[model samples]
Target chain A: MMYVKLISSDGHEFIVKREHALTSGTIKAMLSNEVNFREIPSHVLSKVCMYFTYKVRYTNSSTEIPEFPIAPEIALELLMAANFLDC
Target chain B: MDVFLMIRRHKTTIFTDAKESSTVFELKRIVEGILKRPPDEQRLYKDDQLLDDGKTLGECGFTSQTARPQAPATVGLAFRADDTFEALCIEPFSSPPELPDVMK
Candidate 1:
């Protein structure tokens, strides 16, 4: 059971490794019990997962990583979603 | 996690990315994200065969070998539509109201 399922309000289930999401300090404390986050829609949650990849892959690396790209339409709302997860 | 599925409803279609071993129930749950319905309200099909809720994509032969960018097997999707049913629309949440003074 290294993999944990994270659910979106719109019913998408993301099965991620614990390390993949532990990029967020808040999730480290809040991840054990609930598999679902009703506040996050699939659209926002997909971007959040991509952000997790950016973090885990390049957070403190000495090598260069690709720039994290986000759509302008979702940028502001993505901030709100990020704040809720503290990611 | 190499399985990729194409979900079709009428003329529209969408892709789902999940593991080959993922259950059909899991696929239905994913389809609900855009379909505007619950998994219980969905019926997935492969040709004339109705896929079982308990079956996995691997068991259905939706594995890495056949599912490719061009050859992804298209599965049919049907969501409930009754008087109270919502349309296949992504509900728009209003833009942030705090930024009020900017102009182009």
Candidate 2:
């Protein structure tokens, strides 16, 4: 309904919409309840946040679902982040 | 819309920005919507000064009109519980000298 402040472990901040971030399970818990979960670093979290956008953008759209690009070398890192954040 | 700054204090900080102008009461209300604290309960300070209600930002010396990637005036925030504000005191802010430092 409003917004959220996600602080990466590196101290980077991403100010995204509440609906955009709520797509992820952890962020809902983290910001709403103020729980300090295992902190996420920028590189991994950036992709994770992008996935939030991607997922939200295509929740049930009948339109063609485009690929959410993930660089191969960074693939495993993103999967682990995806696993952790539970998007 | 107007230039905005983060509200920081004691490991409790939310980094977000919004455009707002006019009085200190107007200024404090955005933080209320963001942090959900009442306007009167949220005391804002620019360095060591209090932001009096109804005073224009310039009156409180909070009139730095610049955007980020350059300079946005830093404001301090602390919370109280009642109709009156506690004596002037604030918690330390970010560890980085400036916000942009964290991006790199």
Candidate 3:
């Protein structure tokens, strides 16, 4: 299985399974061609990855709204990233 | 600028101290600073009026006229995510449940 290597701005690396990682429209677009990756902070990118995995697991079977854990201080930043990622 | 207010959203009470000339967007920025939610997602209301981002807190009629003149103004904050706009709630974060083997 092909994997996606996500590199955060501060140099942290998240090696995600391509299937789950491509759930994001932005990521899907980014990986569609010759692009490698882009800079998303570890914190914001972490939430994106989590949601992608959750969506893949529950979109068909679960009717319940999932609770996403986000700290009060990082809400705006994460929200912006979520918009950018289209997730 | 000197006035303060309490922002009540869900279970949290965030106190804000800003100048009377501060705009609603400025207040929202303060909320964003603490809540980490985007300023655009914040809808602040007071005295049945939705505060506009362009208006100042004083222009929005946020003031203290009680026995304790030092009291800060209070506002309600609601947030929008997906298709719903609702009050902010703090919940414990968790990962999705493991995919059942039968479904796989």
Candidate 4:
């Protein structure tokens, strides 16, 4: 039952399973050797965390498109984070 | 008509003034001025749809008032230096470019 803590810049912490978070290249790289954190807001990191869990659950599933209920305003930031995470 | 539009890019949130007649590219150019990035590199989105440069903001559903009661008048913008999808290394506001540490 291994887990990791993702702490946001504003000091919000999210506990996610290691396997679930490893879905993102950034998370894998960050946790591969020494432990470290990221510089993102709580809301943004939460969204990323949710995305990783969703991705893990569906990566091997059907061709059905999944809906991620992200706000329009956060869309660009999400894309940036996605690039940063290389997920 | 003068309008207030919120542009969300990465971790930055910018509130700016525009006219409903302004084209998406016009706003992109303004963003370029602020970010020092080229207009072509910007990809703007509104409610899950990619915004077209030629269309006016009004045509894209931006009004002085929010179309939805609970929503605000805002647009989402994402940018990339190129289509390679390789790690984007953008420099800080000034000097030789390097991606932010968080991004790396």
Candidate 5:
């Protein structure tokens, strides 16, 4: 249950589960590597971070398959994060 | 392009071979056929979401165009989950122009 900080473009910050957040491979890689977390920032993702985090967690309780919303950026981010975590 | 057209024209059978690729407009035709409506008059969608008729499958939600057939349970279904966001990205009019801010 590792947690990592996601900072928005406007300096807003939120922490999410490394596993759940990493579902988007973009954030996942941030957790595993030595990249400059402070440099990339979150200017592009601020509009979506909260909504993304919320939707990724939405899943059928029985099947565990996500009924994900249609946000390509968030999906791409999650894919990148997941790739980062090697999940 | 021929393969794309075939898939597009045969929506009901498309899912039978879900591995086959079909355009959103093509799926529209099939859905229209199912509901007994005209292709042009019919509002078609996957997972209850409408699709743009002009673009190719590649333009819709997909990573690799060759792989992953469209379906809710399958790997690529999310691409179509809500092309509304994608539609808005390309052009606000790509979707229904009269969107209400109710969801917001």
Candidate 6:
């Protein structure tokens, strides 16, 4: 498993697996980095927290790209987790 | 675990952040496990262009990254990720400009 250091807007950090790291384009592109650690800020991620622990991806109809609404507070928490897990 | 299922089952504080949002690649991992195929071998998106991994699925235009204060923006794409995979190209929604007062 790839080792990555995920940083959040609020300054939280996480280390996750590379298989899980592939879930992030930012992390994927930066895979070549010697540190393999990615530091993500809240501003770039829209200040979202409280994300689900597991990396969550799903397949829905392509016609419905409706905004999957989530609370701002939760968004922030998620950012913390993502940055923490390096996912 | 599927985030949706987690949200439903737990029905508690789900949906944390976008950075941690699951990418198509990661999802493919799960799918491959079920289908018994390698990540590269799995065919999810027809174009084979893997979804953005660094950014959250929301950043790639999946769900609301924030609270979505107002109504959804009426612009850009309207794609269905499921069967039929309808990629409805919605014309950018433009609010009509305010009309000037009639001349006397």
Winner by DockQ: 1
CAPRI level of candidate 6: incorrect
Where is model 1 more than 4 Å wrong at Cα?
A: A32-34, B1-104
lDDT of each residue in A31-52, candidate 3, tens digit only: 7722233556665655565566
TM-score of 1: 0.47
Question: Model 4, range B1-104, lDDT digits (tens) per residue?
Answer: 75655466544544455788999999898778666778777888786778899999999988856522122365777777457322322211212234456545
**Given candidate 6, what's the lDDT at residue B80?**
32
lDDT of 1 at B22: 87
lDDT (Cα, tens digit) per residue for candidate 4, span A7-75? 666555455567877888877876772233455665576567667655665577785744657765566
Per-model lDDT: 0.64, 0.59, 0.61, 0.64, 0.37, 0.35
Model 1 residue B52 distance off true place after TM-score fit, in angstroms: 23
Candidate 1 docking quality: incorrect, acceptable, medium or high = incorrect
Docking class of 3: incorrect
- Model 3 residue runs over 4 Å out of place are A1-87, B64-70, B87-104
Q: In model 4, how large is the Cα lDDT of residue A83? A: 91
What interface RMSD does every candidate have?
8.9, 10.6, 18.6, 13.3, 17.1, 14.1
DockQ of 4: 0.02
Displacement of the residue B41 alpha carbon in candidate 2, Å: 1.5
Report model 2's interface C-alpha RMSD after superposition on the true interface residues.
Answer: 10.6
| Per-residue lDDT of candidate 2, residues B25-93 (tens digit) | 876777787667878687878778767877776666544344221234566777786656556543442
The candidate 3 chain B region of ten consecutive residues with least summed lDDT is B63-72
In candidate 2, what are the lDDT values of residues A12-77, reduced to their tens digit?
554456887788886677666222324566556545656665566567989777556665555665
DockQ of each candidate, alpha-carbon based: 0.16, 0.09, 0.03, 0.02, 0.02, 0.03
Candidate 1 per-residue lDDT over residues A1-87, each given as its tens digit: 254556677666554457877877678888643367877776677567656655655668897555667666667778887887777
Backbone clashes, candidate 2:
1
Question: Per-residue CA lDDT of candidate 6, range B1-104, in tens?
Answer: 11221110111111222223667566445434433555554333312333543444444444553222222111111123343344432221112223335411
Query: Ten-residue segment with the worst summed lDDT in candidate 2 chain B?
Result: B93-102
